[PDB]
Symmetry: D2
Subunit: 326 residues, 4 copies
């Protein structure tokens, strides 16, 4: 078991030292619905996210990931996974303090990332006037910015990719669909519990840091929307890191930008390659053939930011780029 115990990535919490600007980024540009406000946080969801929220913005001294929560495939699976972690000496705590959700098990990845598991999730129902004629779509697509449909995946930065990968595979039942190696060292791993290539990935922190967030990605499902989104970001002064293009690794149409708070956000295009074959061997990418893996087109990922910057960062984004530029 453990194999089919995890259903999908339900939500993530981002910390931001410029909470209002981050909120404006997610509403004005990415068209997310705000469903709740309390204390230091604001809760949002894309029009096709199934629960009250998929994103939580929380004011903080620095940027980074407050947590990421995965929803299990049943309440039985939740008990199973939490039991596995506890039996494995992984410290965890049960709680039930989040709007729109129930009992949740909180724990740390081997590198310090805040992870959570839950089953109890309220099915979001929009106000009558905002319900879509498309029955599988809870809310009508907003008429603001270039609206994302839902959260897509999470990419964690780590001092030890294998340690994190092992935890997801062993305790959560994830399978690694693709990975990148240097010698016999894993510097990148993409993992999934369903037909998606991945919903959680882990890449080596080239600065020697640990427990950082590389990026949180949101789904468009249409390549043209990354083109529309980047033109928007360019004209409305949002820093563009790379893209739009497509990574050979995971066959993902990507667009990386930096929201006002300092976190890296990815806009994801076409779903791409779905893993229908139930027992496909993990594909291992090498340095010798990493060109296509990084980008099918002419896109070039900046060493001074993409492979080195993650949040929280001891240096500001500008300070960082200047330091690793050489």
């Amino acid at each position: 078991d453990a194999r089919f115990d995890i259903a999908h990535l339900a939500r993530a919490e981002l910390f931001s030292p410029k909470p209002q600007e981050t909120l404006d980024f997610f509403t004005k540009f990415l068209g997310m619905y705000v469903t709740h406000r309390e204390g230091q946080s604001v809760y949002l969801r894309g029009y096709e996210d199934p629960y009250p929220w998929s994103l939580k913005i929380t004011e903080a001294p620095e940027a980074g990931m407050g947590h990421a929560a995965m929803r299990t495939s049943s309440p039985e699976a939740l008990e199973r996974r939490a039991k596995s972690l506890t039996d494995g000496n992984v410290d965890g705590t049960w709680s039930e303090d989040q709007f729109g959700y129930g009992k949740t098990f909180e724990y740390q990845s081997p590198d310090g990332h805040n992870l959570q598991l839950l089953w109890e999730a309220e099915k979001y129902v929009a106000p009558p006037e905002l319900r879509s004629k498309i029955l599988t779509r809870p809310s009508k697509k907003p008429l603001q910015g270039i609206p994302v449909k839902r959260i897509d995946h999470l990419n964690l930065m780590s001092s030890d990719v294998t340690a994190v990968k092992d935890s997801f595979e062993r305790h959560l039942g994830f399978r690694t669909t693709e990975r990148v190696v240097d010698g016999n060292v894993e510097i990148g791993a993409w993992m999934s519990s369903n037909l998606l290539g991945h919903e959680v990935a882990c890449m080596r922190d080239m600065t020697g840091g640990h427990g950082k967030l590389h990026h949180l990605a949101f789904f468009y499902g249409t390549g043209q929307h990354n083109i529309d989104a980047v033109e928007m970001f360019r004209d409305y002064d949002i820093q563009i890191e790379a893209g739009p293009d497509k990574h050979g690794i995971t066959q993902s149409q990507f667009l990386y930008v930096f929201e006002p708070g300092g976190n890296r956000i990815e806009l994801f295009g076409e779903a791409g390659y779905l893993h229908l074959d139930p027992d496909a061997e993990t594909k291992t990418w090498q340095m010798s053939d990493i060109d296509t893996g990084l980008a099918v087109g002419g896109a070039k990922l900046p060493w001074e930011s993409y492979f080195t910057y993650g949040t929280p960062s001891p240096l500001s984004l500008d300070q960082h780029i200047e330091k690793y530029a050489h």
Copy 2:
């Protein structure tokens, strides 16, 4: 283990009968750019560049069109035995075989309406010769330079005299869940089912002519809306009959394009994957036949009653005669 939700992995292949085998072959190679991996007797085997096994499509010469069979691959060898046993204990006649190139032990059976279905686990993983391998590691073969190449098989739609009976079989015997359905009063006239995050890999719609065990259509995946636009322009200028599309069905949020291959079978070109069912606990969405506009098409597309809701293969009348008959 008694939990059967994950026993079926996906739709592996389908076989189409055609009274014009060569023209049908040309359709799938010249226009849809599929690779031919085997030839035997009166059949030709093909695969899209991203299909994982030796073939996902088999074209067989026959006096009439229709579906020879459809085979689903399980998630493990154990799942195959469990599903086969469920069917057997349910008094469903079944037969084991190992007849096909590129595959192993297979369980053959028929749906309540007579559709030829199959279950299997043993499948050879297709490996392209060095020269045809893609630099994209999850892609077995390079995308062909012929026509508008489809990536893989996507789903199948079966026409039936009793949708509810077919749905019940997939649900209780194969572990499928029904994501969406359409009812007319208190009668189910359409059901879309799945065992994974796809909205569906197998659908069933009521035969409005009174027939049964027919094939409504076999669908192939592009994943890009623009390719349905490119495809239809190609079909129009190269004399392939177009039924409807490109547009998008509200039901299953699928970008569709329906055309008729030379043999008479309806084939669908599928665009963006659309809406993935991430929520593992979502209730079936039920559409009313009386409030179906959005469900049929988000755009201005119109599905002809003279063919879309009445034509399936094999058909008592040839396509032309069928349309003329049901038009008035």
Copy 3:
């Protein structure tokens, strides 16, 4: 000479018995900028329209086109064209009472359509905060709805297509790139004075009416935007007539919807086929073999409205569809 006297379609005015709803349609869904408000009318422009406005919405008892103005290639061209019309005995009037524009020659088509020619047009300059980093783009693309870039073309419904075609060809110097005939009668003509396949089209009125507007089109330039637009119209209750698909005639990616006031509006995708060849013969389509001409894809153009409904209409859109169904 003559051929190059008309530069492009500058603007159009739409009459609407539901002016507020019509304005909401163009701003909330089509993301057009409002540049001026005055009495019974509102002025708008797409973010890439060169002048203060390309669309004027005016409150009226019925729907329809108030007018359409074409800009000339020079001031000399304007005098030449106006003189040609006058010499042809076409009644015309000079004026200068519109915001953002100058001297204008007003006249009517052989079928009663209100047309105008002008040269003096102010070049819109957006406030600094709204200027685009793309220098050829006056304003940033709005963050509302699915923003149209600019006006594209006009399609006039007439009781005599050839009569209208002759006016544009002989007096304005337009060429007819494509046409549709039924026996010896022209029932459709698409005319241009530049690289575009057409900026003004004229189709036969099959109801015995005359001087009506079939539709006004706005440019996206991207096929996916018609897909996004129709999904928006569907979920936000705007009546969809046909599309998205592509007409073989003019090779245009189309999407036809009805705005609240009753006028037909087309959302236009890829520019399509540009007429680079300077002396290509007019392509003539036959009504007897028009399938590809109407739609490359599977789109079906409803006779109950597409070939029969135009504004102003004696019957409401609902009554019309019911009647011709």
Copy 4:
């Protein structure tokens, strides 16, 4: 005056040391039709090119442009333009030795680029079975590779951009829609004689060479096709330089690759922004503030090739990239 004398870019000839590989590139990947073969040359056309050919591939010791020919808007216009060049002391030669075309005037730009003017051009008619149901389309879109529709534009490298610019403006009547400057020095100019932002561009040669070709571009009109094309080139081992993305300058969706012979070829997506305004002022970009001009997206144009490599090149592409690091 001469403002409308030139209609469009009719064709171009590319030299290649690997003629067969270059031919395969344009046929197997870009789906162009071969319409003629003579001596050491092959003639091709996109399915929507109006004449027998838009591209001529000629075997040669080095890469580069054999010539580029523009078609005038009339025979009178040809006489006028040639007259202007001759009166300006520009050496010219009249000839008529090209398949599918008639009398043409051959001359050189101030930097040595081989240019030509002509009016007589045969209208290509495809064999019965290859004619398209779309009447404005001469031949059916091929079922090979990702077929380009037609030639789009040319970009010339020059030791003196202003000199080349003056020639096109003064002698051909072209207008400069956009340009890039550094102080009082023009390092780039985009010119047109019609609604297109440009059909001919000129950029500074940073190596000190002259009369070279930066790139020849072909039209798709669809952004997705550049995405499709780049994936094809990547998996079929064609060197990719930059893109798919969009230049703020000229608002063009670009994809630059190197064909087997060494020439840079651009695949062009959406037509983009059409210059409908007849008297729009030239948009001048500053070299110091050109981020958006180079690319709206995150694309990065490599200095080691994009701004320095042109054909013919004294160094092989490999050696050139190595040299400029």
